[PDB]
Curated annotation (Swiss-Prot), chains A, B:
It comes from Mus musculus (Mouse). One of its GO terms (cellular component) is cytosol. This is Trafficking protein particle complex subunit 3. Widely expressed. Expressed in lung, heart, liver, spleen, brain and kidney. The keyword Lipoprotein applies. Pfam families: TRAPP.
Length: 160, 160
């Protein structure tokens, strides 16, 4: 059954806090969050494929639509918009007006290099690798850093 | 907006995995999970009170009903049953047939002392402390350990 995001967001917060304690270095935390996200994505994809009707596909644009309109809604309760497609159609952006994971959070002094929700990039990359799609996911905008929106840039590297 | 539990459960899994790496001792992990839960509960209560109609109360039985029928549903998508009330009415149990947090999980060799979802005990204790209620929350049954259900025993210690 569906649930609100508050407990999830606070739990993610505990994770970030623990990593900051474990490494005392924002860059290390960013790296670990992405790694964990990757491992999560490799597992999460099995659940998604079982609960969706995409079957076996490899189309990048279809993948963008499914990620934004189905996966994000299913696992985070939000529907980001798909924007800025590259001429080649191998790059696009996910625009989030609101990011549940940053609720109740206030990025402190000197923590500017920290990419708080970096876990999501790993999830996207790990999940897509399992469907034979090598991609690059990265944050280019973050409301926690004063930006108007949160933006995840997606780039298709090659088929695996 | 509401969301499924899979990403939350896998994220919690990453947290437990990290703690196991950080301490290499199940008892330490249990302790840290509970501590984190406590900190989460102290914050989560503010969100709950703002989104509920309980106002300022201190009744233990009412609290049990609200926890099981409102809070668990709101934050975890499940409604545990309330059972085994003590004669004094200062103790009760939360019975969970299904615990989202243990999905996709298989408690390994020698990890028997680990209380995988211990975070929840801390959440309950921390949240209740903020409403002037000192309590003890502990797992007495766990489906991960072969039990028929997951059981969280709640005991009212005193008003703060
Ligand atoms: C076929 O060409 C489309 C296949 C799309 C598969 C998308 C899998 C995404 C699941 C994980 C994303 C989680 C985002 C929060
Ligand atoms: C008045 O006597 C009842 C007040 C009950 C407050 C309950 C607060 C519970 C919120 C945190 C529990 C989270 C469980 C997943």
């Amino acid at each position: 059954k569906k649930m609100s995001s508050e407990l999830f967001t606070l739990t993610y917060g505990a994770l970030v806090t623990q990593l900051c304690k474990d490494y005392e270095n924002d860059e290390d935390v960013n790296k670990q969050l992405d790694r964990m996200g990757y491992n999560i994505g490799v597992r999460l994809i099995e659940d998604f494929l079982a609960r969706s009707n995409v079957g076996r596909c490899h189309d990048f644009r279809e993948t963008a639509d499914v990620i934004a309109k189905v996966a994000f809604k299913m696992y985070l309760g939000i529907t980001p918009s798909i924007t800025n497609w590259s001429p080649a159609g191998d790059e696009f952006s996910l625009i989030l007006e609101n990011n549940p994971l940053v609720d109740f959070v206030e990025l402190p002094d000197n923590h500017s290099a920290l990419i708080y929700s970096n876990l999501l990039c790993g999830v996207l990359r790990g999940a897509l690798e399992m469907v034979q799609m090598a991609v690059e996911a990265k944050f280019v905008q973050d409301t926690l850093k004063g930006d108007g929106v949160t933006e995840i840039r997606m780039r298709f590297i090659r088929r695996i």
